[PDB]
Each structure stands twice: as structure tokens, then as C-alpha cells.
Structure 1
């Protein structure tokens, strides 16, 4: 019989059990809904969405990022939740591909519904899909190219990768600008992948082309009162001390006396302890003192009398980035100055951006952390610019890690689809009919890219398929005119990491959604 459609219902009021065809129906419709939603953002001519939350704050986001879109929607379909989590994991692994993995998974599930209707078992389909995934992996890995050795060509590949990552986003207006920004900012990390080192400050106002990458560093913290505002040849002590009614950690300690005179002596002793702390600090020979924690009035006064710029309430991120940009050591003990390394920058001034003042470190020593000032007309423009910059920076970091590159514009998907097609037409059985569907989804990726522009997607994908069958393994969509071209020449290149991750995560999620023949829901908590 069945758990639900039995003379006895075996379930608590509010539960449910969708069976084989009903389950596959709701799963495919949910996944294909998610995919149809997230496409139309795919590619250079992709368009953005308005998120328009419904809470009482009604946040408003304008995004083209598929991961962001899926995270910020109320999904209740389980297969859709699977695809959402897949896109989130794509955004965690690499910073790009969150719309391509979702569209690919949805297209695979569309083809899988077609095959199930063709009366093929969703294990013969998974078998053929795994063989096709292997073929596509090997074709991709063979198509990949590496330029990490040659510094000039690696720079060119980085610029091309940044341009390709930004093409889909609102920064394609000033793409040649933000590309240089992102590349310089990721090269200033000197091989590290720490994306927290790249700080992004969104300043409302100004044009999007007024955005820049500070040659030094910028900090949105304040300087003390009687303390300088400009410092040339700055010697810097980065700290994490208390400097705020800093009490001895003995917590049972209490001042128990019989005289207000003694209370006053002890208060003076506390103040003298703070003074000796400040003096130990000054014995490092500094002109600037940054503290992760607060700096109270008395140490502020002492640093002012000493002529030291004392920046307070920087945070863990602030002091980490400052250590990276200057060369200093975040300290909490000052009894061995010979061991504490100081930071250096030619100048520390206070500059204006919009209507706010910021500490500007110029002429810094290392520069292994960065600040990018993002200017724009709307908070939505600024948030979307930050998201797009994050995309590009993540991709360039992943490329510096793995210099392997892979051509874009549908060239890679078309090459993988060609390999899958060869495997299929050399393979017997209905696994071949499932491999052909794998290849159809891979081809539907550039089909969608071309659709979003307004071109004859069918004609162009047919031309591409013919080219990759002839042996033009670098043919891809030229989206300026709406034709096919050489991605190697046009500079449309992607990170092999991002393309492989798209492929594998999409295939894996489609497999896991295809293995389901029953959806047993439990009564909502309500």
C-alpha cells in the first residue's frame, strides 16, 4: 500500500509523505523554480533583482549575485533548499559561480525529469551522470592553462579574470577601473589569501568611478584631544592592552581601609600605575599608539603631553590590518621593548571623505593589507559594488593560490559537453541517453548567457558546438557583437578552480536530488 494512502494514516496531524511521482514532481518544480529565478542574472547582459525584505525594517538590496539572492528568499521546498545551500557553499569555496552552479543543477534536474518521463530509472541516470562528470572533469583539466611562472602573462591573466568576474555586475560600467583596483589590492597581499586584509569602506556620495584603492591605509577611528593630527616618519605601537581603569586580574581584591586618606592614597596609586604603564609604552620610542581597546581620559592626557597620537577603539580587525600595513606587533606587555617590533609609515594625517574624517596612513612599510573606498549614489549601489568587489577579490585570491585558468564565454561548458557527447555516443544503453542530457545542460549554460543578451542563442550555441567538434577548443561567445570568437584572444578567462567547482557541485546536488523518491514532512512547529 502506502504510508499516506492507507486505510490507516500513520502520522501526526500536520505531517505529510509525498510518494514517488509526487515527490519527484515537487522536487523538480522547486529546483527548476530556483534556477529560473536565478537566471537572467547570468553573464555580462545579466540584470539585477530587488530583494525588498518584508520584515518591519524592510531592508532593500539590489543584487545580481545568485548566492545572495537565494540566501535572501523564503524557500520552503526541500529540493530548492538543497540548491540554496549548494550556492552558499559555492560562495564559501570560491567567490564566483554561484549563479552558474544553480542554473546547471536546475538544468540537470529538468533533463532528469524529461528522462524519468522517458521511463529511465533515477539510478541509470545517476550512473550516466557520474560517467559524464568524470569525462567533463578530465576535459576541463586538459583544457586548463597555467601562467603563474611568467609574471607578465600572469598579471594579464589576473586582469582578464577580474574583468570576466566583474562583467556580470554593476561595476562593468567602470570595469577597466575596478579591475585594476581589485588586481592591485590582491597583489598587495603578497601571496596571502586573507580577504579580511582588504578592508572596503562604502562612502555614500561621489561617483562609482571616484572609487579607489588607497596607496596606504585608512581608518575610521578618532584621535585623542590634546594629541597631534599629523605625524611624519611615524613610529607606531599597535596594542591590545586595557588602558581603561585597568584593574589587577585578582578579583577577590578589594580596598578595605579605615581612612578616606588611605582611600585617596590607593586612588593615587592606581593613577601612578596607569602613568607607569604609559611610561613603559613611551619607552618604545613611538609617535603613534593604536589600541584595540579603549583609552581613558588619563592615558589620553599622558599621550597628549608626550606628543603621541593615541588612536583608541580600533578593533581586532583594525589592529590586524594595521600590523599587516605597518609591520608592527600587536602587544599587551611593555617590559621588553627590544622585542616589540614597531610599525612605520612616512605620514599619518586626517583626511576627508564625504563628510567624515579618517586616519590616513601613507608611506606604509609593508602594505600587506588594503583599504578600498567605494563611492556611489545609493546605498544599494554601494552594497552591490562591495559584493561585486568581493567576488573579484575572492576569484583573484583563488587564482594566486592556483594559477590554472580556463576560458569563459561558454567555451569551457561547450568543451565539457563535447567530451560528454563523445563518451555518450561511445557508450551503449540508456546511460548514453542520460549522458546526452548532461551535455544538454552543459550547453544550456552558454545558451542562457546568450539569451540574456538577446541573441540567437540557438544559432550561436550551434556554431559553438560545431567549432568544438571541429577542434576549436577556444571558441566561445563574443558578447560585444553577438558572435563566436577566440576566448584566448578576447581575454575571457576563468579560474579552473571556479569552473571545476561549479561542475562538481552542480552534478553532486543534482545526484542527491535525483536519489529522492519520498518526502516525509514533519508537522510544522507553529
Structure 2
């Protein structure tokens, strides 16, 4: 009886396997049509916001799906995982899994908990060989830029924005360059506005704050020496707080003048700081911009926290604390500041030559207000790949090379073990072998005859190769410039045969409502 109280369901053994193995592939078939430019994007509508997302990103494609199954929701984690650690390929990190465990399923006809031993030891041999075939270097900034572009390209392909692939691959490799290795990708913010067309998405060496100058002031600035003030341009008062009572009637006769004056010290403190423009975290009283406009000092009321620093780390002028305590020694060396004239509201600008770098990769795409999103997340998938190469100089060739080398290597070992654990090995390879196969489905080439074709070439060449999606020749990926970073294609491999383990050990389950 008890237990803890039904209704609670319980699935064990045979079916619990299928329902999990078959349960995952369920996700995999839909997920796969997103490999190589001959790749698809899926729509995703959210109940609440009643707005839809269109893009192709394995992480998002699944993070946006309400799915009941534990084995599926599990995969949805793998994706949302690699996306974090690596950044690209998330679309496939499951593909090799669903296939992998579908392999394990057939193999299960034969203990499971041992199959995990193979997939962790045999796909370790694969993991190893893939390091061997890797190509390091160079480390000359002369050569780097030419590789990073090739990476950004191979990644930026197959995404709505592929049309001007270069245009973006450049956007990425730049923002990555600034801030050596390895720095957080949190200072370079991807802002987006709905502006006519595509490719009008440039990279910005400054910041693009939302706010527009207060009053009827100039829209441009020469030799910008901005000022990073904090406190609002309003008469101050202790945070603990205090009350001032006008005990004396004559005390107000002087109190009134104390008003206009206790803020006129703002103007004097501004001109004296040599600063030319200003902007404050907290808001400024209408009694201030008035003085600012006549002087010609520019008013920029209220700025976000992270924006207060962007404007700062752009010119390195230190975040001033309270007006009149600010040294002319601290100022913003901004090259220019303007008000771009977008439809409706227009954002202000903080251009910088270095700069500085606090890149803002603003992207427009009026064509579709929901393509910017669809795009500015692909620019990211680029960025995070152009960085992994900096942190990890290692790189490897795609187009099916990755899997080819493994399944090739792994293949031999399986025929050597002549052990039951050994068959395990062979599947670990046939799972990989599946990835390129699937990569053919989308391009259009017959799979079966395309891997065998591809596996011979690895032998003639080894391991450089791959299967061409579009350009003729079935040419090597190093020639066609189809490569992505090596550690990424590691995490992918391991991280998959990982969930393949945990998920292959469950055997039985218990679910309540």
C-alpha cells in the first residue's frame, strides 16, 4: 500500500529502455535538420508573451519546447549545456546521442551498465585520436585573424544571416580581439534596433545608449571630453535623512537664495573640469539642463548601471562620485558623440578609435523585427567560437572530418578486442559515423555511399577530409576552409556519451503527477 500515496506510475526494464531510447530519438529526428547551410530553422511560439522565435539554435530550439519526458528534457539539458561551455554545435550534441543510445538499444539485445564502460573508454580512444589530428598554430596575430574568420564563417553559415557571412564573421573576430585571452563576453553588449534591411549591422567601438540629450541641445560633439558623474544634479540630502524646519521666518529669506546657489556649484564645477559633455546615473532636475544648455554643456539624464561603466571603460575616465568632487584629470576621451536618427526614438553614440574595447555590435534588420533576434544570437554563436580558438589555439576540420577520424580509429579497436565490451566500441564509432551520414541527408547526397566514400579518403589522406555540402569535388575541409575549434568538438563528444551513460543506467523509474 504505502508507499507514499498514488497515483504514481512505475516503469522498469525492457520498455523503460525503449521508451527512453526511442524516447530520445524522438527529439533527434526533428533536431537534426540544422546541420550545414543546407540546414533548417524551426518556429517556436511561447504561450505567455504570445510572440514567436524562428531561429536555429539547438540550445534555444529545445529550451523553447515544453516537453513532458524526462529522457527528452534530459537532452534539452545537454544542449543548454554545450551552448554555455562551448557555444556552437549544440544542434548536434544530441544528434550523436539519440543515435548513440539507439545503437545501445539494439546492442542491448546484453547488459547495459557495461555498455557505458565501452562508450567511455572506446569513445575515449576516439577523443584521443581527434587530438592527434588537430592542427595547432600559428600564434602570429598576422595568421590568427585569417583563421578566426574561417571559424566565424563555418559557424555563421546555415544561419539566416549567412547571406553576408563575411559581414558578420568580421563583426565577431573583432570584438573577440579586444580584451586578450581570456576575458568575459559580458562587456560587449549586442544591442539591436528594428532598422530597414540586413547588413546594416555594423560593429561599434563605443556604446549605443538609449537616452537622447535633454532640451534643445546640439546633436554632435567635437573632441569629446565627457564627464562620468554619479550623483543627481539636485540639492543633496543625507541617506540617513533629516528634516529641516524653518524655525526662523527670516531664515527663508536666505534659504531661497541657498536653492539657486547650491546647484550653481554644478555649473562652476563642470566648466572647471574641462569636461565638454556629461551624464549621470541618477536623474537631474529641470533646474539643471537649463543652465547646461545655455553654457552648451550637454545633458544626458539617467543611464543604466552596466551602461555607466561601458561609457567609462570606453574612455577610462573613472566613474565620478558627486559633482564638484570631480577632477578635470578624469574625463572621457570620446572621439565623437551623435544622435542617430532612427524612426521614432533615436539612440545617442559614444564612438572610440581603439576602442576601447567595449564593443557594441548593434544589429539592424528591419526586414523582420524578429530576425534581429534570430540573427544577433547567431552573431553570438560566432563570437563564442572566435574566442575558444584564442583560449584554445587547437582547431579541427568539420564537414564530417571530426566523426570520420574517430569512427575510423575506433573502428579498428573494435575488431581487435574480440570482446563483448568490444562490440560496444564498434557502436561508439557507428554513432559518430551517423553524424556525417545525417549531414548528407540535408545536403542531398546519398548517405550510405557517402560515408564509405568519405572513409576511404581519410585513409588515402587521413584525417583531413569531409563531405562537401554544396561546392563540388567532395574536397578536403582544410582547402574549402570548413573548420571549427578542437576543444569544442571534444566537449561535444564526451558530454554526449555522458548523458548516454547516466541515461543508459536508469533501468527503472517512478513518476508522480
Is the TM value for this pair above 0.5? yes
Q: 1:318 aligns to what? A: 307
From the superposition, tell whether residues 143 and 298 of structure 1 become closer, same or farther in structure 2 (CA, over 3 Å).
Answer: farther
Runs of at least 5 residues in structure 1 that lack an aligned partner in the other structure: 1-7
TM-score, structure 2 length as denominator? 0.93
Q: CA deviation at 1:98?
A: 0.9
Q: 2:99 aligns to what? A: 107
Q: 1:21 aligns to what? A: 14
1:220 partnered with 2:213: no
Partners of 2:356 and 2:484 lie apart in 1 by 27
SS of alignment partner, residue 228 of structure 1: coil
Q: 2:467 aligns to what? A: 477
Partners of 2:221 and 2:362 lie apart in 1 by 22
Q: Which moved more, 1:133-142 or 1:159-168?
A: 133-142
Q: 1:82 aligns to what? A: 74
Partners of 1:19 and 1:358 lie apart in 2 by 60
Partners of 1:283 and 1:14 lie apart in 2 by 76
From the superposition, tell whether residues 486 and 517 of structure 1 become closer, same or farther in structure 2 (CA, over 3 Å).
Answer: same
**Contact persistence 2:205–2:358 (CA under 8 A):** no
From the superposition, tell whether residues 271 and 398 of structure 1 become closer, same or farther in structure 2 (CA, over 3 Å).
Answer: farther
Q: 1:5 aligns to what? A: none
**Contact persistence 1:331–1:340 (CA under 8 A):** no
TM-score, structure 1 length as denominator? 0.91
From the superposition, tell whether residues 455 and 249 of structure 1 become closer, same or farther in structure 2 (CA, over 3 Å).
Answer: same
**Contact persistence 2:205–2:357 (CA under 8 A):** no
Q: CA deviation at 1:411?
A: 0.5
Runs of at least 5 residues in structure 2 that lack an aligned partner in the other structure: none
From the superposition, tell whether residues 270 and 421 of structure 1 become closer, same or farther in structure 2 (CA, over 3 Å).
Answer: farther
RMSD: 2.4
Partners of 1:316 and 1:270 lie apart in 2 by 29
> Which of 311, 317, 338 in structure 2 is aligned with 1:328?
317
Q: 1:395 aligns to what? A: 385
Q: CA deviation at 1:71?
A: 0.5
Q: CA deviation at 1:410?
A: 1.0
From the superposition, tell whether residues 35 and 501 of structure 1 become closer, same or farther in structure 2 (CA, over 3 Å).
Answer: same
Q: Write the mapping of 1:330-409 to structure 2, written as runs, cut at 5 A.
A: 330-333=319-322, 337-338=326-327, 341-364=330-353, 366-376=355-365, 377-409=367-399
Q: CA deviation at 1:110?
A: 1.0
Q: Spell out, residue by residue over 1:278-320, the C-alpha distance to the aligned partner (whole angstroms, 9 max, x if none).
A: 5445432201112233223223233334422232222122122
**Contact persistence 1:51–1:60 (CA under 8 A):** yes
Q: 2:45 aligns to what? A: 52
Q: Write the mapping of 1:233-272 to structure 2, written as runs, cut at 5 A.
A: 233-243=223-233, 246-251=236-241, 253-258=242-247, 262=251, 269=258, 272=261
> Which of 472, 479, 486 in structure 2 is aligned with 1:489?
479
Q: CA deviation at 1:340?
A: 5.7
> Which of 155, 162, 169 in structure 1 is aligned with 2:152?
162
Q: Spell out, residue by residue over 1:309-343, the C-alpha distance to the aligned partner (whole angstroms, 9 max, x if none).
A: 23222212212222232222222245664596322
From the superposition, tell whether residues 11 and 231 of structure 1 become closer, same or farther in structure 2 (CA, over 3 Å).
Answer: same
From the superposition, tell whether residues 305 and 491 of structure 1 become closer, same or farther in structure 2 (CA, over 3 Å).
Answer: same
Q: CA deviation at 1:62?
A: 0.5
From the superposition, tell whether residues 369 and 363 of structure 1 become closer, same or farther in structure 2 (CA, over 3 Å).
Answer: closer
Q: Which moved more, 1:498-507 or 1:479-488?
A: 479-488
SS of alignment partner, residue 399 of structure 2: coil
Q: CA deviation at 1:214?
A: 3.2
Partners of 1:240 and 1:214 lie apart in 2 by 25
Q: Which moved more, 1:434-443 or 1:272-281?
A: 272-281
Q: Spell out, residue by residue over 1:119-173, the C-alpha distance to the aligned partner (whole angstroms, 9 max, x if none).
A: x211220110111232122112212222251222211110100000011211111
From the superposition, tell whether residues 247 and 219 of structure 1 become closer, same or farther in structure 2 (CA, over 3 Å).
Answer: same
SS of alignment partner, residue 350 of structure 2: strand
**Contact persistence 1:293–1:313 (CA under 8 A):** yes
From the superposition, tell whether residues 372 and 366 of structure 1 become closer, same or farther in structure 2 (CA, over 3 Å).
Answer: closer
1:210 partnered with 2:208: no
**Contact persistence 1:101–1:506 (CA under 8 A):** yes
SS of alignment partner, residue 418 of structure 1: helix
From the superposition, tell whether residues 154 and 262 of structure 1 become closer, same or farther in structure 2 (CA, over 3 Å).
Answer: same
Partners of 2:177 and 2:111 lie apart in 1 by 50
Partners of 1:295 and 1:217 lie apart in 2 by 21
SS of alignment partner, residue 462 of structure 1: helix
Q: Give the number of the structure whose residues are more often strand, by fraction.
A: 1
Q: Write the mapping of 1:42-191 to structure 2, written as runs, cut at 5 A.
A: 42-55=35-48, 57-116=49-108, 118=109, 120-191=110-181
Partners of 2:246 and 2:343 lie apart in 1 by 55
From the superposition, tell whether residues 266 and 433 of structure 1 become closer, same or farther in structure 2 (CA, over 3 Å).
Answer: farther
1:291 partnered with 2:280: yes
Partners of 1:100 and 1:133 lie apart in 2 by 17
Q: CA deviation at 1:391?
A: 0.7
